[PDB]
Enzyme design. Structure first.
Site, PDB file in Angstrom:
ATOM      1  N   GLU A  11      -9.153  47.863-114.793  1.00  0.00           N
ATOM      2  CA  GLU A  11      -7.981  47.171-114.278  1.00  0.00           C
ATOM      3  C   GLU A  11      -6.865  47.009-115.297  1.00  0.00           C
ATOM      4  O   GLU A  11      -5.702  46.920-114.901  1.00  0.00           O
ATOM      5  CB  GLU A  11      -8.376  45.780-113.750  1.00  0.00           C
ATOM      6  CG  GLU A  11      -9.334  45.819-112.577  1.00  0.00           C
ATOM      7  CD  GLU A  11      -8.703  46.389-111.316  1.00  0.00           C
ATOM      8  OE1 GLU A  11      -9.432  46.549-110.309  1.00  0.00           O
ATOM      9  OE2 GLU A  11      -7.475  46.682-111.324  1.00  0.00           O
ATOM     10  N   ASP A  20       0.554  47.557-107.855  1.00  0.00           N
ATOM     11  CA  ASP A  20      -0.744  48.181-108.030  1.00  0.00           C
ATOM     12  C   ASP A  20      -0.662  49.637-107.584  1.00  0.00           C
ATOM     13  O   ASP A  20       0.419  50.154-107.291  1.00  0.00           O
ATOM     14  CB  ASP A  20      -1.829  47.351-107.334  1.00  0.00           C
ATOM     15  CG  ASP A  20      -1.901  47.567-105.840  1.00  0.00           C
ATOM     16  OD1 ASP A  20      -2.880  47.073-105.246  1.00  0.00           O
ATOM     17  OD2 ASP A  20      -1.021  48.221-105.251  1.00  0.00           O
TER      18      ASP A  20
END
Length: 162
Positions: A11, A20
């Site tokens: 991440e 994202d």
């Protein structure tokens, strides 16, 4: 290696609101804020999550706090899900981390829909599960991460994260 270090690798960490891989506003260590196209809606969610007027920026400690909560939520989501819990309980610790990683990324409901893969994992047909897992939008959209997670399911080792 542990689930936290594993997800930190997958991440990253960014202290400003960012989009994202699916274009959704996100912050910290993969903390989805909203699927709304409104950056104001995302900033509101961020202030709600942190408990202060952040204006879209948080500290490293704040990012780690959301991350701890999100990992916690992913595990509780697995244990509360009738399809995921039997699979989770049948797995060893390393492969449990791979399942938590999947739930962290795509949500309890999304992973619980991997019916055929979940069956193969439950059956400990690792190579077969790995082949099935790659036949997915998940793999095609984030292939390098999916490969690491799939390798973790296939081998029960951390080889893909070292």
């Amino acid at each position: 290696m542990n689930i936290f270090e594993m997800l930190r690798i997958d991440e990253g960490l960014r202290l400003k609101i960012y989009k994202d891989t699916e274009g959704y506003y996100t912050i910290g260590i993969g903390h989805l804020l909203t699927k709304s196209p409104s950056l104001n809606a995302a900033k509101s969610e961020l202030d709600k999550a942190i408990g202060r007027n952040t204006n879209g920026v948080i500290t490293k400690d704040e990012a780690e706090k959301l991350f701890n909560q999100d990992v916690d939520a992913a595990v509780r989501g697995i244990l509360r899900n009738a399809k995921l819990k039997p699979v989770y309980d049948s797995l060893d610790a390393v492969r449990r981390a791979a399942l938590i990683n999947m739930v962290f990324q795509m949500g309890e409901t999304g992973v619980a829909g991997f019916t055929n893969s979940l069956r193969m994992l439950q059956q400990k047909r690792w190579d077969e599960a790995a082949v099935n897992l790659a036949k997915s939008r998940w793999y095609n959209q984030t292939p390098n991460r999916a490969k690491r997670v799939i390798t973790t399911f296939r081998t029960g080792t951390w080889d893909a994260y070292k």
